[PDB]
Symmetry: C4
Subunit: 206 residues, 4 copies
Amino acid sequence: MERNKLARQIIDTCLEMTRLGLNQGTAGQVSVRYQDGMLITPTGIPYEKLTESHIVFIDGNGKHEEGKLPSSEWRFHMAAYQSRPDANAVVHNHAVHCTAVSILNRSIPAIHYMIAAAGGNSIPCAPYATFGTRELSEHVALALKNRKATLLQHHGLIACEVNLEKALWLAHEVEVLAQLYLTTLAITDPVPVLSDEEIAVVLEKF
Amino acid sequence: MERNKLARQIIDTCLEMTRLGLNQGTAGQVSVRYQDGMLITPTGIPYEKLTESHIVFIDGNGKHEEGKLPSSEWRFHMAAYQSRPDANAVVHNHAVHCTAVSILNRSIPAIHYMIAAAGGNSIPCAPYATFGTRELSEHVALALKNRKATLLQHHGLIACEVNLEKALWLAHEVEVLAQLYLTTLAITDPVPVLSDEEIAVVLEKF
Amino acid sequence: MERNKLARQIIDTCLEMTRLGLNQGTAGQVSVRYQDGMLITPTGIPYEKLTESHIVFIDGNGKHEEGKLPSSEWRFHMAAYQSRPDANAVVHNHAVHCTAVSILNRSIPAIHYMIAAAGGNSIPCAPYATFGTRELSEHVALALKNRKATLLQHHGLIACEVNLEKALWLAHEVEVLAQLYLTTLAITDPVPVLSDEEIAVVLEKF
Amino acid sequence: MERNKLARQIIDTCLEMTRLGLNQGTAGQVSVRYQDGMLITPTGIPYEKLTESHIVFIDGNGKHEEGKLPSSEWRFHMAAYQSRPDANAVVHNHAVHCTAVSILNRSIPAIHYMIAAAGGNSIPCAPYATFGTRELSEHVALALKNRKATLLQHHGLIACEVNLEKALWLAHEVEVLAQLYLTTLAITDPVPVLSDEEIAVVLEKF
Ligand SMILES: [Zn+2]
Ligand SMILES: [Zn+2]
Ligand SMILES: [Zn+2]
Ligand SMILES: [Zn+2]
């Protein structure tokens, strides 16, 4: 569990995220819980030019390593870690279907049983606030209180989980749920949903 | 027709299914008829980490090999084999277009002549039941009585055929038919269909 | 211009067609004008298992080589060659956007200036007839009289051109035009089009 | 900063553009500012057959190198360079989502905060004019006065920036914004937008 191994995993997750079609250009970031803060990708540097040494350490006070510039969206990664003690990895991206649902400012309701993967019967959509601000951080911390993923209005998605593999897995599943919702919403509104009783059974079963 | 060769084919089918874009994360499973039961993929293990030895044997009584955990959705694979004696391979996935049609709880009608590939003039949609239950198994067995593929409401698709190659081929074709249906339904409802007389001619010709 | 070189080009075109996402499963076929008839892909054989020796010669009388089974849809390839003397290669596929427009039974109108690539201000849609019949062949021959591509109602697309490279290029462009049409039709009907005067200028310029 | 290095970058950008799904067939072109004019890709030659020596130099008077045929759409690349002195690279393509919005003749409004990447609160759509004409060039020069990207009605997109990497990055981002707009427009019209005050904050922050 050396820093370099965690750095490597972050980079591999970046590449896999792009592979899955969830990350376009320099939009996403991946972070992991580390010591008293986190390791996160830097600002600027395109993912394919990333090396272990580019990964940035930000302590619990929000001070980042010397000579490195963390992602411009680092603050809500720290908000996620402080809001959800169980979270050890965070994935943020601007995946198209998730982002399209965030533009409509809708939660994703229980249209499929895999919605329970994020912890309840919905995927919330936190209100808009300028990127990189403390206001945006507060909305994300409230949205993640009882869910492991949330949409961000006019912006994108944040997903957290116990490790990088699971966080990416969750982020992908939410993009699929988002695409199912938009595809069905174009045909019928509202879209048929499973009852809260049914989701309670699925939650227990998971 | 050794176990190891069948195991290899299952794994290759998994990889090909992901390649075709039908399988996201750990959602799908592939099984084959074997001896008095079946060989199926295990629960948990991501497809790219799968080795021959991970494949699970489940006998006709539903008892699985020691120390292996079969897919959580194994029961409806067994239901398919008992309902359709001619089926030797089963593919299940949560492909997005198929799943979106299953959310609307619609059958796919005869919008294209390749609908006859699944045996009739439609692709049915079996009613919802919690994953992994005997109730869900009963709905699938009734739906596969006269069709080789069925949608599962709020869930996904199941396709069966005489070998793995054909089962995957069928599963892909049904996802295409599903995408054609949703794309046209967004424009016009109902969507123009071929008559039952015409599908009878195609069926004879196939 | 040996047979084997033409066979190789056919196979490469098959692979490229699948690469471009125009060909799913065993749906498409590619043919070239040769001697007094044509060389076409066989029925059954999946594209990745195709070898030079699998390609089938069908003479001008419709008699095919001994021991080989031509595509089930060979007859409308012959109809294309007899209707358009200038055509030396034919591509048929069931590309999703083209096929979705064929289900609506609509021509694609002049929504983009590249529509002129197929010879006029539209992409026609020939009426449905059972696959492999002489009736279907007659509809295709009438549709290709003044266009190099046509949709086939409830079925797919046929594109022809002076060589394989250009035929595939045309088939791809028509699938893009089809996707533009369906994407815009979902928002507004009718879709804005360029005038016949404007298309006449583009045609001259090409 | 030799000619050959710039030629190589152009070719790599072509390949990357096709990789990202923004360039179909021979539709796009890439140019760079060079000496008193520009280097641009040639007409005809498919991107995968392009070599350093195929790249064409066009001086400030519009005279192109001997024995080479520049892209048929070179004139609006020159218009971009003369309208925006800061632009050193230009990307043009007929990306499907951008082109679909250009068919509707709509600007893309501030549905996402990344709209500020092109310089303001919108992506304009310049009026139609026949490809390759001076009229089309004038519309593009007016549209790029205060934006780094513009749609071209019934045609496609043009994006410019300080280097090839950034120009392609911008072109990709605009295609994502276009897909978000069409996906949301199919559900609701008008689509929710951020206020001009909010975009002013984002612009300052960038
Ligand atoms: Zn963001
Ligand atoms: Zn399932
Ligand atoms: Zn066909
Ligand atoms: Zn153009």
